[PDB]
Amino acid sequence: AKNLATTDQSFSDDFNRSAMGGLWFLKSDTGTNQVGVSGGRAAFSGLTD
Amino acid sequence: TAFVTFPEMFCDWGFALGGTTGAQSTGTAHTHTLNTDGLAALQIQILPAGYAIGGYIGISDTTIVDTIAMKMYKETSSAINNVYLEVFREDSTGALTSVGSVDVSGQLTTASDYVEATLPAGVIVNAGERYVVRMRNATTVGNRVGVSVMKELVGGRELSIRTETATDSNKTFYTPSEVLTAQGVSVIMPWAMMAAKNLATTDQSFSDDFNRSAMGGLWFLKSDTGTNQVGVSGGRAAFSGLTDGNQNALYIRPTAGDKQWVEATLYETGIAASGAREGLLMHANRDLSQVVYLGVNLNTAKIYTGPWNSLTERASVSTTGNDVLWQMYFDPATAAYTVLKNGQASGLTWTDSGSVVAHGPNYRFGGLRISRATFFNAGRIDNWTLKDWA
Amino acid sequence: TAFVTFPEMFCDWGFALGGTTGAQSTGTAHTHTLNTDGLAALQIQILPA
Amino acid sequence: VGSVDVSGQLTTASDYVEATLPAGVIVNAGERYVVRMRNATTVGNRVGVSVMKELVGGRELSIRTETATDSNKTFYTPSEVLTAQGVSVIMPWAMMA
């Protein structure tokens, strides 16, 4: 399949699940807490600055 | 989930030889008979300090890498250090860029054993790109390192890199010219692995509108009728056939954890005659050894436990107008099951004080159940859904 | 993306032999020792028009 | 989770033997399954199985039991599984379709 008519990939996430999941590489300056999903919305986990 | 330069089964196993050899170099002409005592497998390549060897790794499905592995050992028992395993991404131009490295000299063993090392941070990979797992071995003491490789045959594609100078071994950003030179120089091909040991597992959820022609391969069907199973008609599941008995459909795809939430709408259940039991199944074994079942008739709704052959009633409640979108879920914080009718509490709750229900990897399957008796099929079901509520 | 009758890694590479052969056809009875000099790989078939 | 008798359809020539399970068994990605050949015959004729030799120094993932009780076992324990893995020296070819 040497050459294909490549489509334009598109993705969407409602963030309406329990955990962040493996579909998101997380990197934070806190050290332990990353972007956490709560109440169906992403937010800053932890009380750190 | 991982990617290997060539299947690990070759490193783990070998082929038995057979047939007959050919002519001799000198002496009386004879041909020896091959047998199982001859083994075809990977070879071992010793390598001195300052010599780096690596192989290209394909990416099948995109994910996040966490660790890398190689099959190697040390020749002598002397102390060693400065043994590095690193990962290089190949750009469009073919240049190699370092995206991670790790010291593995501490955990090395004299015996030929796997070496698995965690990267300092995750490196996202995508299907279609190529990666190289390089072993550096820039030690100071001088003990050599033996890596398990498999011999390459000339005349084919060259996709292994090998560098001898200490400068090239310590290089962290190879240019295309140096990559081509290393590919030309290289004569072996090492065994390398890029793994996905730990992932942030999601809460898997599934749903089916039951709006197709056949039952489909996404449902394991088991019934006491013998021949007929849950059949889809008019876009709704139903008890196929005129026989008296029970039918169950189990979703092939399991959920993530013990937290379960199943929901479906009950249709044509207010016209039932007597004893028509149908509804949803949660915490179902693959072999249906023990299940938690929600049975709704035209009069009441009950919760059942146990194998499909014989069910035990745990709780019951008398309701009316049972043609709505029923839901029922399990909270492991209190180990309790709660049923919500049309978004209302409906006062249906069971508490497992005795822990009669076992929760584990083999008890995360849901499904649907119908029963038919006395020439009156139970209601039909639609909009089936299972998920892991937060 | 492609489909192959058997993995191309065999077509590109080979295996190193090891072990020991069996009895000989004639002469003094002996068994040779296998080493990395023996290569196990696919063969080449000639074919006329 | 499933057993089948394949003595009737066996042939002296080395040929594939395919047997239907009594009922379907759902499987999921990430789990592991073992296809065990028992051979608890009464006449005493031996059975030859096509295997592929394993090399030492690698992972052990084949099971081999010798005693009749072990062969007739239905629910193995982790200790017995480890002992069988250590004892085994061959790896058989098995398919689940």
User: Chains C, B in contact: 3+ Cβ pairs under 8 A?
Assistant: yes
- Burial category of B263 from C-beta neighbours within 10 Å (exposed 0-12, middle 13-18, buried 19 and up): middle
Size of interface B-D (CB pairs under 8 A): 42
Candidates C8, C11, C17, C39: best to mutate against B (most CBs of B within 10 A) is C17
Candidates B39, B56, B149: best to mutate against C (most CBs of C within 10 A) is B39
Question: What residues in A contact C2, CB-CB < 8 Å?
Answer: 1
Check: CB of residue B224 under 8 Å from CB of residue B297.
Answer: no
Q: Where are the alpha helices (DSSP H) in chain B?
A: 8-12, 166-170, 176-185
Instruction: Name the β-bridge partners of B113.
Output: B72
Candidates B4, B10, B12, B34: best to mutate against D (most CBs of D within 10 A) is B12
D52–B286: do the CB atoms touch at under 8 Å? no
Question: What is the four-CA torsion angle of B34, B35, B38, B41, rounded to 10 degrees?
Answer: 100
C12–B150: do the CB atoms touch at under 8 Å? no
Question: What is the four-CA torsion angle of B373, B377, B379, B384, rounded to 10 degrees?
Answer: 90
- CA distances, B354 to each of B207, B335, B357 (Å): 32, 10, 8
A5 contacts chain C (CB < 8 A)? no
C43 contacts chain A (CB < 8 A)? no
Question: What residues in A contact C4, CB-CB < 8 Å?
Answer: none
Give which of B309, B367, B314 is closest to B337, Cα–Cα. B314
Nearest CA in chain C to B28: C27
HSE-up of residue B341 (Cα within 13 Å, Cβ side) = 20
Give which of B11, C33, B6 is closest to D57, Cα–Cα. B11
Nearest CA in chain D to B16: D53
Which method was it determined by? Answer: cryo-EM
- Burial category of D5 from C-beta neighbours within 10 Å (exposed 0-12, middle 13-18, buried 19 and up): exposed
Helix (H) or strand (E) run with residue B4 in it: strand B2-4
C18–B40: do the CB atoms touch at under 8 Å? yes
User: Chains A, D in contact: 3+ Cβ pairs under 8 A?
Assistant: no
Give which of B125, B5, B161 is closest to B70, Cα–Cα. B5
Q: What is the phi/psi pair of residue B179, to 5°?
A: -65, -45
Three-class SS state of C8? helix
**Residues with Cβ within 8 Å of residue C7, at least 6 apart in sequence:** none
Radius of gyration of chain B (CA): 31
Give just the sign of the alpha carbon dihedral D94, D62, D32, D78: positive
Q: How far is C49 from chain B (nearest CA, A)?
A: 24
Amino acid at C46: I
Q: Residue with structure tokens 């893995």? A: D85
Distance CA B293, CA B309 (A): 13
Q: How far is C45 from chain B (nearest CA, A)?
A: 16
Which residue in B112, B222, B287 is closest to D57 by CB distance? B112
Which subunits have 3 or more CB–CB pairs within 8 Å of chain A? Answer: B, C
Three-class SS state of B30? coil
Q: What is the DSSP letter of B318?
A: E
Three-class SS state of B272? coil
Largest CA distance in chain B: 99
Sheet holding B173-174, edge to edge: B160-163, B52-58, B130-135, B84-90, B96-103, B173-174
B364 contacts chain A (CB < 8 A)? no
Which residue in B201, B259, B388 is closest to A22 by CB distance? B201
B25 contacts chain C (CB < 8 A)? no
Q: What is the phi/psi pair of residue A22, to 5°?
A: -85, 0
A4 contacts chain C (CB < 8 A)? yes
Give which of B390, B289, B306, B303 is closest to B348, Cα–Cα. B303
Distance CA B120, CA B102 (A): 7
Token couple for B56: 């290209």
Three-class SS state of B133? strand
B272 contacts chain C (CB < 8 A)? no
B46 contacts chain C (CB < 8 A)? no
Token couple for C10: 């065999």
3-state secondary structure D17-51: CCCCCCCCCCCCCCCCCCCCCCCCCCCCCCCCCCE
B150–C16: do the CB atoms touch at under 8 Å? yes
Helix (H) or strand (E) run with residue B334 in it: none
C2 contacts chain A (CB < 8 A)? yes
- CA distances, B125 to each of A3, B128, B190 (Å): 22, 9, 21
Token couple for B382: 């639609």
Question: What residues in D contact B287, CB-CB < 8 Å?
Answer: 1, 25
- The DSSP line for B174-201 is E-HHHHHHHHHH----B-EEEE------
Give which of B154, B381, B370, B390 is closest to B263, Cα–Cα. B381
Amino acid at B80: I
Radius of gyration of chain C (CA): 17
C1 contacts chain A (CB < 8 A)? yes
**Residues with Cβ within 8 Å of residue A13, at least 6 apart in sequence:** A23
Largest CA distance in chain A: 51
A47 contacts chain C (CB < 8 A)? no
Chain-centroid distance, C-alpha B313: 36
